[PDB]
Design a protein around this ligand. Structure first.
Ligand SMILES: Cc1cc2nc3c(=O)[nH]c(=O)nc-3n(C[C@H](O)[C@H](O)[C@H](O)COP(=O)(O)O)c2cc1C
Ligand SMILES: COc1ccnc(OC)n1
Length: 334
């Protein structure tokens, strides 16, 4: 099973709590995170993009770096881990993304990939008046499809003449071309989404579900595996969890309750037994060995190729995972 880290590109990571570690997303923090991750043989790092926050006492995700520049910087200070940036396709022309990815390919030596995102919240895009109306809700995938087609032309051959409803290319050039085949990623959960993933993505990101119910996401992995049958393409699931670990189950449970107790509820309304303190993320709470066991249970779901991990505390989380969780995991004995 592959393991990656979901790097905090917004403040306070994935906890909306006054009891959660409070920190700003800085390059040097992310640098320290990816370098630790690389040290413990994590396979990849991924940064979302978030163009607007949810306010509140903690000002959750009001401070957010830009993904392609953050990963170009992380690329220049790592050597082995895989680096994925997220392009919000409404805000960047495909030809630019294409060139940006060639560029981070050059920095990283073939370690870069791109995570293509529709955009879901209207506020992110209306705020800068580029949201294309409510037609987009059920037509993003038609848009995304033309988009990916321009990228493939440019990475593939270095030119594109694509003519569709949304883009017009007239001998568009982009060289150099990526030194390796350019990995693309998607995180659609809908039928459209999976359909897209199966055609063009190299793996699909889905959400873990429940506290301490590791294999609860299995349906969606099964659905993603079904959608992949329809294109004959090997397109695995990579599931997002928050790990809250400790030396014992009681200890870890105590951290978890502590976080949920300090919920920033003003910030939680703007968004609107799992807790919304991590946006109802799938969470594994327990001792190092409890958590190792549950991840072993994740590696055994059909479709599951890897997990994408957040922590309550990234620097110690990545360390405890490296030192105490990983080496008890069957699925990581290589
Ligand atoms: C690991 C992961 C990362 C994601 N990153 C982003 C992101 O960076 N930006 C974003 O707008 N949405 C992001 N999403 C949300 C999805 O792109 C998507 O909108 C959602 O899961 C619903 O699926 P659909 O688009 O097929 O309806 C992410 C989802 C997952 C599982
Ligand atoms: C948990 O991370 C998530 C979840 C949902 N949507 C986004 O980005 C918009 N990020």
């Amino acid at each position: 099973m592959k393991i990656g880290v979901f790097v905090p590109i917004g403040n306070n990571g994935w906890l909306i709590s006054t009891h959660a570690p409070q920190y700003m997303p800085t390059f040097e923090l992310n640098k320290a995170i990816v370098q630790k991750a690389e040290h413990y043989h994590f396979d990849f790092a991924l940064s979302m993009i978030k163009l607007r926050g949810f306010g509140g006492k903690t000002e959750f995700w009001d401070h957010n770096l830009e993904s392609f520049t953050l990963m170009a910087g992380l690329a220049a200070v790592t050597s082995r881990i895989q680096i994925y940036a997220t392009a919000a396709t409404l805000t960047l022309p495909p030809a630019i993304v294409a060139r940006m990815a060639a560029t981070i390919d050059s920095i990283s030596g073939g370690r870069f990939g791109v995570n293509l995102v529709t955009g879901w919240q209207k506020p992110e895009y209306e705020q800068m008046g580029i949201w294309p109306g409510d037609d987009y809700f059920s037509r993003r995938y038609d848009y995304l499809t033309e988009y990916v087609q321009v990228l493939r032309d440019l990475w593939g051959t270095g030119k594109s003449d694509f003519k569709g409803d949304f883009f017009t290319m007239n001998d568009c050039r982009v060289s150099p071309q990526p030194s390796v085949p350019m990995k693309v990623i998607c995180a659609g959960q809908s039928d459209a989404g999976m359909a897209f993933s199966a055609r063009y993505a190299d793996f699909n990101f889905c959400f873990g579900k429940g506290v301490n119910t590791p294999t609860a996401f299995a349906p969606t992995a099964a659905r993603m595996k079904q959608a992949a049958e329809q294109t004959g393409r090997d397109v695995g699931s990579y599931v997002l969890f928050m790990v809250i670990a400790d030396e014992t189950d009681d200890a870890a449970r105590a951290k978890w309750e502590h976080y949920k107790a300090g919920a920033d509820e003003e910030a939680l309304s703007w968004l609107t037994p799992t807790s919304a303190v991590n946006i109802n993320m799938g969470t594994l709470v327990g001792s190092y060995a409890s958590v190792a066991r549950m991840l072993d249970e994740v590696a055994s779901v059909p479709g599951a190729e890897g997990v994408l991990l957040t922590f309550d505390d990234f620097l110690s989380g990545i360390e405890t995972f490296g030192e105490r969780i990983q080496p008890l995991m069957q699925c990581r004995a290589h």
